[PDB]
Design a protein around this ligand. Structure first.
Ligand SMILES: Cc1cc2nc3c(=O)[nH]c(=O)nc-3n(C[C@H](O)[C@H](O)[C@H](O)COP(=O)(O)O)c2cc1C
Ligand SMILES: Cc1c(-c2ccc(-c3ccccc3)cc2)nc2ccc(F)cc2c1C(=O)O
Ligand SMILES: CCCCCCCCCC[N+](C)(C)[O-]
Ligand SMILES: O=C(O)c1cc(=O)[nH]c(=O)[nH]1
Length: 360
């Protein structure tokens, strides 16, 4: 419990917790324990990455959706993540979907969720981040940046204005902001319309004072058509979007899922998403000519999984579902395995491996 023993968590503690608790209850408990620092690897120079205007001490981040309301940021750095992304946060508070809304697929090492952007709202999260704003400035300077993922309310009549409000309220507190094209669990969340939305978002970001001006990334689904991907790549290049987060959960249900709950509505995460996500990274890296930083996300639970996404074009990776199965020790596991594989494959560090598959 205190050592951080990978086997004890993976074989005993986490499975026991999952047998006692429904997944939303376990999620809530995890956020509470993490926020108190009740947690069980030394980052080497090989893992440092410079992207998005920032130093990242290691390339392994916690994906959006774990700390939706910015309650456990410091605990997540204590867990060993190189960067933390909170959210999604919506402008007004909203409850999200009725419970149950989170479903485990243990036989698939996967989860399906339909949280529906449950959020404390911008004002609450703003005041929470302001309470530790200088602590975060020091963490960022130390190579531990903070991302904020912005969502839209269910009953909003103007999606672009919801995102613009997010930029104005939490932009000044973030190293990067994220706008999803891609929750599966809201509404209808042409190319001119993404262009319209992102133009407004970037105008709002550009209007912030320079020390308070975050990078802006777009987070995309794994379920896009070839046309959608080409169009996104074009708009990102046209507008100078700073980066992409690839990918959110999938609304597909790959052949072979075994879990009893496989036909629940929602986004699927974890192992069944992994290679769909890696392939989407590969495609977006090629379409953007390797000039647009990608954060690769979807089914990362080992160093091999991380390095496959880096070699496909990711500069940084995130994980979430692996934490739910294997617990806090998975972060150091991924970092240790990634360092070993980098050495084994002749890379001087992470930076040298970014996009390496495209050069072979
Ligand atoms: C329970 C849960 C809630 C999520 N909530 C959000 C969210 O609010 N915003 C977001 O951008 N992604 C959200 N995601 C997606 C994750 O950030 C991530 O893109 C996806 O789960 C794939 O990574 P993984 O396979 O490592 O979990 C959520 C995922 C899960 C499992
Ligand atoms: C177990 C779990 C956890 C979790 C993570 C970390 C920890 C943990 C343990 C020790 C210290 C800190 C944290 C405990 C529990 N978080 C989730 C998040 C979302 C979700 F959908 C499901 C879960 C689930 C689940 O499958 O029931
Ligand atoms: C979220 C419930 C997890 C239950 C057990 C969590 C382990 C406590 C960590 C122990 N310790 C702080 C001392 O390292
Ligand atoms: O809140 C949610 O349902 C949610 C949002 C998102 O972006 N992705 C996801 O899988 N769930």
């Amino acid at each position: 419990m205190a050592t951080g023993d990978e086997r004890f968590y993976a074989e005993h503690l986490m499975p026991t917790l999952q047998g006692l608790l429904d997944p939303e209850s376990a999620h809530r408990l995890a956020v509470r324990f993490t926020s108190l620092g009740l947690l069980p690897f030394q980052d080497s120079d090989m893992l440092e990455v410079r992207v998005l205007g920032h130093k990242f001490r290691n390339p392994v981040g916690i994906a959006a959706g774990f700390d939706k309301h910015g309650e456990a940021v410091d605990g997540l750095y204590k867990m060993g993540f190189g960067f933390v992304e909170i959210g999604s946060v919506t402008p007004k508070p909203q409850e999200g979907n009725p419970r149950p809304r989170v479903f485990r697929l243990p036989e698939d090492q996967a989860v399906i969720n339909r949280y529906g952007f449950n959020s404390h709202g911008l004002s609450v999260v703003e005041h929470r981040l302001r309470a530790r704003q200088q602590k975060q400035a020091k963490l960022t300077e130390d190579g531990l940046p903070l991302g904020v993922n912005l969502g839209k309310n269910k009953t909003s009549v103007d999606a672009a204005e919801d995102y613009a409000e997010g930029v104005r309220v939490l932009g000044p507190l973030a190293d990067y902001l994220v706008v999803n094209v891609s929750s599966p669990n809201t509404a209808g969340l042409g190319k001119a319309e993404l262009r319209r939305l992102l133009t407004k978002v970037l105008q709002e970001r550009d209007g912030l004072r320079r020390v308070h001006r975050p990078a802006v990334l777009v987070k995309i689904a794994p379920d896009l058509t070839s046309q959608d991907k080409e169009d996104i790549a074009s708009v990102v290049k046209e507008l100078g979007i700073d980066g992409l987060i690839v990918t959110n959960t999938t609304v597909s249900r790959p052949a072979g899922l075994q879990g009893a709950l496989r036909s629940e509505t929602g986004g699927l995460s974890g192992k069944p998403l992994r290679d769909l996500s890696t392939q989407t990274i590969r495609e977006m890296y090629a379409l953007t000519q390797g000039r647009v930083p990608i954060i690769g996300v979807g089914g990362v639970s080992s160093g091999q999984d991380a390095l496959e996404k880096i070699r496909a074009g990711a500069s940084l990776v995130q994980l979430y579902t692996a934490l739910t199965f294997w617990g806090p020790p998975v972060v150091g596991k991924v970092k240790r395995e990634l360092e070993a594989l980098l050495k084994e494959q002749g890379f001087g560090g992470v930076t040298d491996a970014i996009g390496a598959d495209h050069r072979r």
